[PDB]
Design a protein around this ligand. Structure first.
Ligand SMILES: CCCCCCCCCCCCCCCCCC(=O)OC[C@H](COP(=O)([O-])OCC(O)COP(=O)([O-])OC[C@@H](COC(=O)CCCCCCCCCCCCCCCCC)OC(=O)CCCCCCCCCCCCCCCCC)OC(=O)CCCCCCCCCCCCCCCCC
Ligand SMILES: CCCCCCCCCCCCCCCCCC(=O)OC[C@H](COP(=O)([O-])OCC(O)COP(=O)([O-])OC[C@@H](COC(=O)CCCCCCCCCCCCCCCCC)OC(=O)CCCCCCCCCCCCCCCCC)OC(=O)CCCCCCCCCCCCCCCCC
Ligand SMILES: CCCCCCCCCCCCCCCCCC(=O)OC[C@H](COP(=O)([O-])OCC[N+](C)(C)C)OC(=O)CCCCCCCCCCCCCCCCC
Ligand SMILES: CCCCCCCCCCCCCCCCCC(=O)OC[C@H](COP(=O)([O-])OCC[N+](C)(C)C)OC(=O)CCCCCCCCCCCCCCCCC
Ligand SMILES: CCCCCCCCCCCCCCCCCC(=O)OC[C@H](COP(=O)(O)OCCN)OC(=O)CCCCCCCCCCCCCCCCC
Ligand SMILES: CCCCCCCCCCCCCCCCCC(=O)OC[C@H](COP(=O)(O)OCCN)OC(=O)CCCCCCCCCCCCCCCCC
Ligand SMILES: CCCCCCCCCCCCCCCCCC(=O)OC[C@H](COP(=O)(O)OCCN)OC(=O)CCCCCCCCCCCCCCCCC
Ligand SMILES: CCCCCCCCCCCCCCCCCC(=O)OC[C@H](COP(=O)(O)OCCN)OC(=O)CCCCCCCCCCCCCCCCC
Ligand SMILES: CCCCCCCCCCCCO[C@@H]1O[C@H](CO)[C@@H](O[C@H]2O[C@H](CO)[C@@H](O)[C@H](O)[C@H]2O)[C@H](O)[C@H]1O
Ligand SMILES: CCCCCCCCCCCCO[C@@H]1O[C@H](CO)[C@@H](O[C@H]2O[C@H](CO)[C@@H](O)[C@H](O)[C@H]2O)[C@H](O)[C@H]1O
Ligand code: SF4
Ligand code: SF4
Ligand code: SF4
Lengths: 52, 155, 176, 115, 186, 94, 145, 52, 45, 318
């Protein structure tokens, strides 16, 4: 969860209450490099579910 | 010299108390989620000696982590009164600090300091888990500065 | 499309039935759970050594507010009151009048930091980048009154934090 | 005398720690502090009200079974007898009857708690 | 004080009773010693205790009242009691057994010094024993609470508020009207 | 990443997984914390001609509700019956 | 055997901190004895280190000065002591330390950083920054009446 | 754009806590499956409606 | 200059696992019981 | 000299209990991918000292509705009886050599349950009462099986003397011929010490703090020390019962070192187990013991009466 909070903070500047999705679209475009880091997170997450 | 002895005994009881702060398992709203992240591995509050305990009888700190409504106010005061002493209150987030987003509502207490005395205010909506930890360490340093025995000696 | 999460009939052959008896009597699946927590005991913990180490943040982080200046030292804020109008919490209070040189400038600029929801709308609305949310998040106080910022406090914050704020704005202004 | 001394010391030590606990700290007693705890709200009714026991039948069966172990505990000594033919038969007879008694209470739904 | 600040308001309260007082709470705490010692069995002393909120409201009105400048007031309760009757009422309200016994002045003084040894907050003192057995002066010439608009609160209406916490679980829920009041010296 | 070979084997065996391939602590595979500046694109309305706002005005196309009946043949349903779902072919049973 | 190499690495840490005294100082001040590369030092005495083989979050750290703005911080340290130019690098908002990417200089930026001053005589006290709104009539100073 | 991504809805058979727990665990796996498609199919362009 | 925003790599990202993977380990039921009885008998003797 | 022997027993017990609290917090911490205490003293070595001092200068509370005498008595009983459980333990020599040492430990364990019942009842509050009645259920669940499990093991040793178990296991650990009983013994000790997944009398997530919910400060510390003292003692009992250490009369310290290592590891397994499993429902614990262990325990009690007789391997009475 803490790593996913970082994704929130990188698009919006807030870990939780992003206020990012707005009527009309989103507030800001993804910062460069964010999608690589989401991919790295998602690559390993299923193993974390397997441990649970 | 009594002054020297009471000074050292102050350091000991202060050190023991700040090194073993047991917050009450008590959370109100979204600020309580960041409080969970302070207990989570990245920050590991337990490594500072900070350990949640559900019973108010076994708690030293009340962290008011979220909005205090009028309906909830008597229960918050109740469990604070049931904490033995010394006890401390940390106000976490805008809602607890002064009402926040809901300041002008008919159902919200405009700051938990209308109900209980507050030792530390942690700003944010929510404060980050690190911000809350900064507030806990600020409380520890406040306890370190206490002069209970030195003042008693000079009474 | 859908899938069933729990719809399977166990095999009733002798080997399978004896495998399940061993699991029941010899607690095999409970022993397997012990293996998982054992593997974690020998993993490096995720804890960081705060305050000597800090959790990562980005240039967009919304923290303590500050009032900014132009490179000349003049205040950026020209008292348009857009931030006060947009503030979802009504945390901003502004008064203004012509300055002694005729400039349009504020005589009051208060942010009730216990009302504020740290949403960043004020810095979006500002047309001159006068009001920002800086990167500081370690400003907890001992009293409520210390969180009622007036203009002097907010200008000091800007002077205190401008070196970091300007570098953060530089990193993110092309996304705005 | 050694046993009595050891017991006296253990409970004296515990009692002293309780005396320190009550006379060392600074107290601040008032009504709301010492009121009973129920998660922040006042209790409804006394805690002395009857609290139904749903395992009442297992509890009574425990008394009978608890006494069987008093009959069985001497078994290590009884095994030292020359009359092992009798002792083994009687030893197994007692355990079997305990097993039969457990089986009866089990089949007749005596181990299930009242709903 | 009247010389340094001639315009001062000087307020002279009797023994003040309230939740955190050292009066009703003091008598109720004598129960840990069994019987309740009293000089002359409390039949020689009279008290006129006043409620804490009455004194508070009198102070607040003195601030706002221009007539209060330079005056000296006496804040007393509505009723005068014998010290024996007062303590008997305290133990009745708290539902604790009341075993008064006579103790002469010199004996009470000796125990007062016993408790003065404590370096903390003495449970009682020689001086405290004296003040509790001092009769509450009658000062008709001084203005009182009614002069500042405060209506004195009878001890009968507030004793339970102070003394409910001194009961055991058996008697905690007893209501205000269950105990019969104390004889008031007419 | 600094775990010795023996410890790596121990936790690999206890968990039953090769944990070194999917570590939950992040090292050098993450994005750099400084990035080159972006150059975001513009939207379909960024034109110098043939772009009159009245032709792309969603708000002014909204209309009041259609009054079907007011108090001023085959039976119908609100929509066709929902089609029955199919079992997954990726993994029908968990 | 690796278990022998691990002991050497841990024994090396005592020399990397300049002997047992320096090792015990960092053990008791920061509860961590790792040795990193000195990235730089700020004018208050804070020392900044990196080790990029550590995992993200543990790869940068500060050893706070023992005195700052006349306050003894040998035991009492807090995150607000980090000056703004180093704050960005320490929180990983940038890759470049201020030794490499210096901040832009302005004549109004504080030369001396201040830590959190709450609970001290330097604390902030709020007040209204506006002047009196209604001017009252002042009666004359002579009896003409 | 949920009509453009492929995922499975987990279904229980007993309607108890255990089946609802399995559904939530399988929904996490499907979320990772959806996230993978969003990472690969992210299109270029603006991020809020071009209508000021 | 050209447009530059956060985009997937040209070939797409590598494969991502998501299916449940709880591997099968352990001896057969027969072997486990046989070892348990073998230890009992050696103990008795 | 005997008074000195007593003090060299209970003072170390209290110190070991204090540092077990640190070890559990660290062990749990690392199994949870975090560190646990590492600030208060190096590697958290002073953390237990701060906690103890903190509690004993904290204000103790006597609840308004509580039965005063029973409220004070119960924590004294808990700690006093926890220390009493140690005096017959052969390590390798007991402080008090008893003929029926096992029977003494059973009786002292039964008496200790009343420190939970009376504390819960004397508190006069609903969560405390619920916690106390869970202890009634817990004792009913495990007590019969626990005694009969011991009996079966003692039919190989021949007596109720704890030192005889050292002799019995001179050649081989009793876990070999009695691993089925060792398994059921181990679970019973978890229920006996009110440990996870049988931490029901406290049951934090359900009862806030159960029986001790009204206890603060020093009186609370007494219950905590008693519990952790029982955790170590019950795992020392287990080591003696099933993993008997060899005793060289001329080098008794070699026994102590070996026996201490075994006791520590068994104690660690308690912490390990607490990190791994969810909690039983307290009716499900009763059915576990009565419908599973008790049938198996009765059968194995029959088998261990017959096995010495049919193999001609009955132990000596003396
Ligand atoms: C009571 C018991 C304790 C008394 C015996 C104490 C024995 C000495 C302990 C030495 C530990 C010091 C480790 C070290 O060198 O620091 C490296 C470290 C630098 O190395 P590093 O860069 O961090 O790399 C770490 C590894 O890469 C990453 O770490 P790692 O996980 O790869 O560990 C490396 C090494 C570290 O281990 C050791 O060196 C000690 C092994 C003793 C095992 C005792 C049990 O362990 C091994 O290589 C494997 C063999 C060790 C036995 C493993 C068996 C596990 C149990 C089996 C599973 C089932 C359990 C049931 O330096 C330090 O931090 C010094 C800190 C000192 C801490 C205090 C140590 C003393 C502990 C108390 C002493 C008694 C009082
Ligand atoms: C080591 C001893 C540990 C226990 C320490 C007990 C004293 C605790 C201090 C205390 O009670 O707080 C102050 C407490 C006064 O505080 P309070 O709230 O105003 O009054 C409490 C209740 O009025 C009276 O308190 P209560 O509601 O608990 O009732 C008093 C007492 C009732 O006592 C009686 O009614 C007569 C005495 C009966 C005990 C004599 C033996 C009874 C038959 C059993 C044979 C055992 C012989 C020994 O209750 C008992 O049954 C005492 C059980 C003692 C068992 C000792 C184990 C042997 O006690 C006094 O200072 C008097
Ligand atoms: C019974 C006696 C028990 C003695 C406890 C000794 C306490 C040791 C200690 O204070 O830790 C060092 C402490 C550590 O300092 P600290 O608690 O302020 O450190 C803050 C946390 N760090 C360091 C991580 C930033 O030293 C002191 O602060 C002096 C306290 C004196 C205590 C009174 C002794 C008499
Ligand atoms: C596992 C066992 C662990 C046991 C650990 C035992 C604790 C070891 C550490 C001892 C440190 C010294 C104790 C100081 C704590 C005192 C509590 C406190 O903070 O009060 C503040 C008070 C402050 O009082 P005050 O006068 O300033 O104001 C309080 C009153 N109001 C609220 C109105 C303001 O300090 C004192 O009153 C006295 C301090 C005395 C210091 C010496 C202690 C003597 C203790 C003897 C008491 C006599 C009864 C016998 C008790 C048993 C004797 C052992
Ligand atoms: C020569 C002929 C010889 C004759 C003798 C032969 C005897 C050997 C063969 C008999 C079988 C031997 C094994 C018996 C062990 C006890 C078995 C048992 O009772 O466990 C089964 C029990 C059943 O419960 P459940 O699975 O929920 O379903 C039952 C449906 N009524 O399930 C449970 O009890 C689960 C327990 C849950 C709590 C576990 C928490 C701890 C788990 C880790 C413990 C690891 C073991 C540690 C042992 C250490 C010992 C020092
Ligand atoms: C011949 C005859 C000789 C008779 C000798 C005996 C005479 C007795 C003298 C009575 C003195 C009255 C003392 C009153 C008293 O002790 O109560 C006060 C004190 C409790 O403290 P308190 O004053 O209420 O406020 C601070 C609380 N933290 O103290 C307490 O009440 C606490 C008592 C605790 C129980 C100890 C007994
Ligand atoms: C409700 C409030 C509860 C408060 C709890 C207070 C603590 C209660 C503690 C439990 C009380 C029962 C204690 C019984 C001790 C039995 C221990 C034992 O059996 O051995 C003691 C010993 C016998 O020696 P043994 O090895 O059996 O054979 C003779 C060879 N020497 O023989 C001896 O050592 C001498 C023993 C004689 C004195 C025993 C006194 C017990 C009476 C109860 C106290
Ligand atoms: C899968 C996890 C299950 C979870 C349940 C927890 C189980 C943990 C059990 C802990 C006990 C492990 C065994 C203890 C090994 C300690 C070894 C030792 O220190 O002593 C050496 C000992 C041999 O010496 P000794 O016991 O004297 O010989 C027997 C003759 N009487 O022993 C030789 O090795
Ligand atoms: C509900 C009621 C249930 C009743 C159950 C009764 C179960 C009884 C089962 C039989 C148990 C005894 O079985 C019997 O044991 C004795 C030993 O004790 C054996 O006796 C044998 O060994 C003993 C010594 O140990 C010799 O003295 C004897 O001469 C020899 O025959 C018998 O060879 C065997 O037949
Ligand atoms: C001599 C010692 C060794 C011999 C063992 C002695 C104990 C023997 C106990 C025999 C119990 C037989 O009778 C018991 O009755 C109930 C009916 O309520 C049966 O059935 C019921 O209980 C079981 C488990 O609780 C449930 O799975 C089942 O759904 C339910 O219908 C049990 O499956 C059966 O085991
Ligand atoms: S301060 Fe913000 S995060 Fe905290 S409870 Fe209020 S709205 Fe939620
Ligand atoms: S961040 Fe949001 S709530 Fe706070 S002052 Fe700015 S607009 Fe108002
Ligand atoms: S801070 Fe910006 S938006 Fe607010 S009044 Fe000043 S110029 Fe306008």
């Amino acid at each position: 969860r803490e790593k996913m909070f970082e994704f929130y903070e990188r698009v919006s500047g807030a870990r939780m209450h992003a206020a990012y999705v707005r009527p009309g679209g989103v507030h800001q475009d993804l910062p460069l490099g964010l999608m690589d880091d989401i991919y790295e997170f998602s690559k390993n997450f299923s193993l974390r579910i397997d441990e649970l | 010299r009594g002054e020297y002895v009471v000074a050292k005994l102050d350091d000991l009881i202060n050190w023991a108390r700040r090194s073993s702060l047991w917050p009450m398992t008590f959370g109100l709203a979204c600020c309580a989620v960041e409080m969970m992240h302070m207990a989570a591995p990245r920050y590991d509050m337990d490594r500072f000696g900070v350990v949640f305990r559900a019973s108010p009888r076994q708690s030293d700190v009340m962290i008011v982590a979220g909005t205090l409504t009028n309906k909830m106010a008597p229960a918050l005061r109740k469990v604070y009164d049931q904490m033995p002493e010394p006890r401390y209150v940390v106000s976490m987030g805008s809602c607890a600090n002064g009402g926040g987003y809901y300041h002008y509502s008919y159902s919200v207490v405009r700051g938990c300091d209308r109900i209980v005395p507050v030792d530390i205010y942690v700003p944010g909506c929510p404060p980050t888990a690190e911000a809350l930890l900064y507030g806990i360490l600020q409380l520890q340093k406040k306890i370190k500065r206490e002069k209970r025995l030195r003042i008693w000696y000079r009474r | 499309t859908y899938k069933y999460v729990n719809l399977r009939e166990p095999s009733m052959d002798m080997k399978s039935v004896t495998d399940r008896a061993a699991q029941t009597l010899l607690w095999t699946e409970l022993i397997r759970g012990l293996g998982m927590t054992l593997s974690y005991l020998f993993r490096e913990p995720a804890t960081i050594n705060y305050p000597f180490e800090k959790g990562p943040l980005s240039p967009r982080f919304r923290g303590e507010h500050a009032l900014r200046r132009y490179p000349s030292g003049e205040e950026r804020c020209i008292a348009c009151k857009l931030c006060e109008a947009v503030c979802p919490a009504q945390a901003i209070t502004i008064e203004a009048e012509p300055r002694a040189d005729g400039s349009r400038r504020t005589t009051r600029y208060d942010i009730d930091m216990t009302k504020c929801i740290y949403c960043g709308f004020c810095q979006e609305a500002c047309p001159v980048d006068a009001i920002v949310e800086g990167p500081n998040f370690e400003f907890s106080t001992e009293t409520h009154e210390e969180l009622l910022y007036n203009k002097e406090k907010l200008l000091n914050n800007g002077d205190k934090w401008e070196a970091e704020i300007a570098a953060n704005i530089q990193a993110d202004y092309l996304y705005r | 005398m050694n046993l009595m001394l050891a017991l006296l010391t253990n409970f004296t030590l515990a009692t002293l720690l309780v005396i320190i606990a009550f006379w060392l700290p600074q107290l601040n007693v008032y009504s709301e502090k010492t009121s009973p705890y129920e998660c922040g709200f006042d209790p409804m009714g006394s805690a002395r009200l009857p609290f139904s026991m749903k395992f009442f039948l297992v509890a009574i069966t425990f008394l009978l079974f608890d006494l069987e172990i008093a009959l069985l505990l001497p078994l290590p000594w009884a095994s030292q007898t020359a009359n092992l033919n009798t002792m083994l038969t009687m030893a197994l007879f007692l355990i079997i009857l305990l097993a039969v008694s457990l089986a009866y209470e089990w089949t007749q739904k005596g181990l299930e708690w009242t709903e | 004080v009247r010389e340094t600040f001639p315009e001062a308001t000087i307020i002279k309260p009797a023994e003040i009773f309230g939740r955190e007082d050292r009066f009703l709470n003091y008598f109720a705490n004598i129960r840990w010693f069994g019987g309740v010692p009293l000089i002359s069995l409390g039949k020689k002393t009279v008290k006129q205790p006043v409620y804490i909120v009455d004194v508070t409201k009198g102070i607040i009105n003195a601030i706002k009242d221009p007539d209060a400048r330079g005056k000296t007031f006496a804040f007393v309760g509505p009723s005068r009691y014998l010290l024996f009757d007062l303590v008997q009422y305290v133990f009745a309200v708290a539902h604790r057994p009341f075993l008064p016994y006579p103790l002469p002045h010199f004996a009470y003084r000796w125990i007062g010094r016993l408790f003065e040894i404590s370096p903390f907050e003495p449970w009682t003192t020689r001086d405290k024993v004296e003040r509790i057995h001092t009769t509450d002066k009658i000062l008709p010439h001084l203005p009182g609470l009614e002069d500042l608009g405060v209506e004195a609160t009878p001890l009968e209406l507030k004793a339970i508020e102070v003394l409910r916490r001194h009961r055991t679980y058996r008697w905690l829920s007893s209501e205000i009207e269950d105990v019969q009041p104390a004889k008031t010296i007419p | 990443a600094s775990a010795t070979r023996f410890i790596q084997w121990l936790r690999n065996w206890a968990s039953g997984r090769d944990l070194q391939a999917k570590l939950q602590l992040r090292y050098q595979e993450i994005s750099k914390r400084t990035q080159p500046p972006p150059k975001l694109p513009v939207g379909p309305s960024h034109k110098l001609s043939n772009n009159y706002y009245c032709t792309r005005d969603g708000r002014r196309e909204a209309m009041p509700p259609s009054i079907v009946m007011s108090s001023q043949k085959k039976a119908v349903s609100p929509a066709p019956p929902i089609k029955r779902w199919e079992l997954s072919q990726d993994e029908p049973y968990l | 055997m690796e278990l022998l190499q691990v002991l050497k690495r841990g024994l090396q840490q005592v020399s990397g901190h300049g002997g047992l005294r320096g090792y015990l100082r960092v053990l008791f001040r920061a509860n961590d004895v790792r040795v990193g590369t000195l990235v730089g030092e700020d004018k208050y005495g804070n020392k900044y280190y990196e080790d990029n083989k550590q995992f993200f979050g543990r790869h940068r750290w500060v050893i706070y000065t023992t005195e700052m703005n006349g306050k003894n911080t040998f035991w009492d340290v807090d995150g607000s002591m980090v000056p703004p130019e180093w704050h960005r690098w320490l929180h990983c908002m940038t890759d470049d330390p201020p030794t490499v990417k210096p901040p832009t200089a302005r004549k109004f930026i504080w030369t001396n950083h201040k830590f959190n001053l709450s609970g001290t005589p330097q604390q902030y006290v709020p007040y209204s920054t506006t002047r009196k709104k209604i001017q009252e009539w002042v009666p004359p100073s002579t009896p003409y009446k | 754009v949920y009509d453009q991504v492929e995922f499975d809805v987990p279904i229980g058979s007993r309607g108890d806590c255990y089946d609802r727990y399995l559904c939530r665990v399988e929904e996490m796996r499907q979320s990772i499956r959806i996230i993978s498609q969003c990472l690969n199919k992210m299109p270029p362009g603006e991020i809020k409606v071009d209508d000021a | 200059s050209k447009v530059k925003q956060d985009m997937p790599p040209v070939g797409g990202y590598g494969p991502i696992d998501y299916k449940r993977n709880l591997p099968r380990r352990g001896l057969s039921g027969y072997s486990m019981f046989a070892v348990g009885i073998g230890a009992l008998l050696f103990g008795y003797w | 000299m005997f008074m000195i022997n007593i003090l060299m027993l209970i003072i170390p017990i209290l110190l070991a209990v204090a540092f077990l609290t640190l070890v559990e917090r660290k062990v749990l911490g690392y199994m949870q991918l975090r560190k646990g205490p590492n600030v208060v003293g190096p590697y958290g070595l002073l953390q237990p000292i701060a906690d103890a001092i903190k509690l004993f200068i904290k204000e103790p509370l006597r609840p308004a509705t509580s039965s005063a005498s029973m409220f004070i008595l119960a924590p004294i009983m808990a700690l006093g009886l926890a220390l009493t459980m140690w005096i017959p333990l052969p390590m390798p020599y007991p402080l008090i050599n008893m003929n029926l040492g096992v029977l003494f430990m059973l009786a002292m364990s039964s008496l200790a349950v009343y420190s939970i019942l009376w504390s819960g009842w004397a508190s006069n509050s609903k969560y405390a009462l619920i916690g106390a009645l869970r202890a009634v259920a817990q004792t009913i669940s495990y007590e019969v099986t626990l005694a009969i499990i011991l009996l079966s093991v003692l039919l190989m040793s021949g007596s109720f003397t704890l030192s005889t178990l050292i002799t019995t296991q001179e050649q081989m650990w009793l876990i070999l011929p009695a691993w089925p009983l060792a398994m059921m013994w181990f679970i019973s000790t978890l229920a006996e010490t009110n440990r996870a997944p049988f931490d029901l009398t406290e049951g934090e997530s359900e009862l806030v703090s159960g029986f001790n919910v009204e206890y603060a400060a020093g009186p609370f510390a007494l219950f905590f020390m008693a519990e952790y003292a029982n955790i170590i003692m019950m795992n020392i009992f287990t080591a003696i019962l099933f993993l008997g250490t060899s005793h060289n009369p001329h080098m008794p310290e070699l026994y102590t070192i070996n026996f201490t290592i075994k006791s520590l590891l068994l104690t660690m397994s308690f912490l390990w187990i607490r990190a791994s499993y969810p909690r039983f429902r307290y009716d499900q614990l009763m059915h576990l013991l009565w419908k599973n262990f008790l049938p198996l325990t009765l059968a194995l009690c029959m088998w261990h009466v017959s096995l010495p007789i049919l193999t001609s391997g009955i132990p000596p009475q003396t």
